[PDB]
Design goal:
part of a larger assembly, 2 chains, A: 26 strands, B: two-stranded parallel ribbon, 6 helices, RNA-binding, 40S ribosomal protein S17 (chain B), structural constituent of ribosome (chain B), ribosomal protein (chain B), mRNA binding (chain B), ribonucleoprotein (chain B)
Chain lengths: 322, 119
RNA sequence: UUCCGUUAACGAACGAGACCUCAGCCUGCUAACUAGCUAUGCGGAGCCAUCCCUCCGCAGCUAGCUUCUUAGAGGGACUAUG
């Protein structure tokens, strides 16, 4: 069996840069774009087989406009509605999806911000930046620590940070950061020191992944070579090969799958067998110049559906068979 | 008239040479990258130089190009330029000649020469 | 005389361009009783009249106020994409 196609939705004018999905409030997808809006889609799951299988997977519900530049990454609150988004204006914002207004605002990142992420207790907020610094924020949008600086100031990278995520193990909270300096680091929320430096790629990194059980540390990026690492202590298990650039990475919530967006199609490997078993192509093959990449992906809570957001503000949805 | 002048074109090429790896095909990210490596005195100059570098990368990613010397392609055009076949295609076994060629070879005293015969 | 390129020329200097001012976009940032909008209170006038509704006046420890006004910091356009 495999992944299958249902439709494509078009709600963003420019390249979609992130999708996030909830686990407790399921039929509410949220996607960010280079349009400073932040769209939220509602799911009755229509397939209108009346007009040549009329193409719409759903109906847009709400735009959270208000950011002053491209929105780069978004995430959702793990307990309720709230969402957090980072953008090129150097800000972070907390939105309330039940009313469409912003509620908080994290000022202080001296330059552009590229990644956001929540936590278990939702009190520990991380921001990665072109500042070449990471900063941790509370729920109040005020400062407690900021890891960065050059070698003397500390162990911060020297290029821009490009992505950060947590380790979902509850007795050992950490944060893994991929960088344009071609280096991945692992940190700790206990002391904001680094456990290990996971010195990998030869080109710039744009993606880092942490296993749903927090055991291994997929990271992608420039060369097309994905490297999987050891979360316990920094060990490179094996290498995978995609060929082209890599932007987004994800793990299936429960099934042992790793997905990637690699600039010519979406490539799903297997971790049961370190070998590709699924490629996913854009439906419309028009001969215009180099076709839409997929820029971001996400699974649902149940793994029943994967979402891919591309460079034309088009988002194509992928279901499973049975 | 949107001809780019010497400063933009020169700076575009000369920043392509120094950092090929850290540039890309999107204008905006290339704008930011170019803001992180060089000191320019106007936003309009930056937008213009980044715009000329982005399609320079598009055509680099396409094929070859003039004066900029990329390392990853100057060695790749050398690794296969010192390239040898299995054995030399210029072989002295079947080299057939026409009347006056053996006439000169008889002039030199190499009348008997292994591998020479008339057309 | 902008550039590609050609090429007994090679490498440079001015002018053009860049540049500076004003106008054009920003429900994003900073604010503002010598700018105001909003709501609430009291005051008047209408009226299915008692309230509600509409239109003005007035005063503040009303604003999770700065949209409108002002002026600063930036952002935005590069022919970027086809």
């Amino acid at each position: 069996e495999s992944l299958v196609y249902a439709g494509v939705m078009r709600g963003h004018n420019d390249v979609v840069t992130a999708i996030a999905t909830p686990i407790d409030n399921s039929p509410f997808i949220v996607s960010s774009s280079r349009d400073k809006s932040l769209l939220v889609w509602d799911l009755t799951n229509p397939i209108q087989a009346t007009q040549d299988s009329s193409s719409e997977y759903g109906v847009p519900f709400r735009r959270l406009t208000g950011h002053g530049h491209f929105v780069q990454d978004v995430v959702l609150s793990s307990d309720g509605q709230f969402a957090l988004s980072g953008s090129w204006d150097g800000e972070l914002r907390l939105w309330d999806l039940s009313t469409g207004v912003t509620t908080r605002r994290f000022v202080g990142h001296e330059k552009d911000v590229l990644s956001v992420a929540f936590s278990i207790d939702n009190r520990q907020i991380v921001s990665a930046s072109r500042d070449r610094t990471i900063k941790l924020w509370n729920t109040l949008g005020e400062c407690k620590y900021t890891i960065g600086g050059d070698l003397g100031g500390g162990e911060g990278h020297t290029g821009w940070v490009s992505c950060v995520r947590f380790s979902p193990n509850n007795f050992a909270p950490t944060i893994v950061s991929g960088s344009w300096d071609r280096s991945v680091k692992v940190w700790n929320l206990t002391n904001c020191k680094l456990r290990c430096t996971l010195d990998g790629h030869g080109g710039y990194v744009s993606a880092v992944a942490v296993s749903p059980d927090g055991s291994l540390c997929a990271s992608g990026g420039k060369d097309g070579v994905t490297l999987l690492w050891d979360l316990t202590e920094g060990k490179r298990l094996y290498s995978l090969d995609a060929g082209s650039i890599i932007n987004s990475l994800c793990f299936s919530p429960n099934r042992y799958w790793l997905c990637a967006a690699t600039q010519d199609s979406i490539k799903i490997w297997d971790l049961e067998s370190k070998h590709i078993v699924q490629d996913l192509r854009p439906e419309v093959p028009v001969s215009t110049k180099q076709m839409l990449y997929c820029t971001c992906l996400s699974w649902s809570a149940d793994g029943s559906t994967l979402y891919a957001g591309y460079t034309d503000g088009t988002i194509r949805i992928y279901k499973i068979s049975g | 008239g949107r001809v780019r002048t010497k400063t933009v074109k020169k700076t575009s090429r000369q920043v392509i040479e120094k950092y090929y790896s850290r540039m890309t095909l999107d204008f905006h990210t290339n704008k930011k990258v170019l803001e992180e490596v060089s000191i320019l005195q106007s936003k309009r100059l930056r937008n213009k130089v980044a715009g000329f570098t982005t399609h320079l990368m598009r055509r680099i990613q396409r094929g070859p190009v003039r004066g900029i010397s990329l390392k990853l392609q100057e060695e790749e055009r050398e690794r296969r330029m010192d390239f040898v076949p299995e054995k030399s295609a210029l072989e002295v076994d079947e080299i057939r000649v026409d009347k006056e060629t053996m006439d000169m070879l008889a002039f030199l005293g190499m009348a008997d020469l292994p591998g020479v015969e008339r057309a």
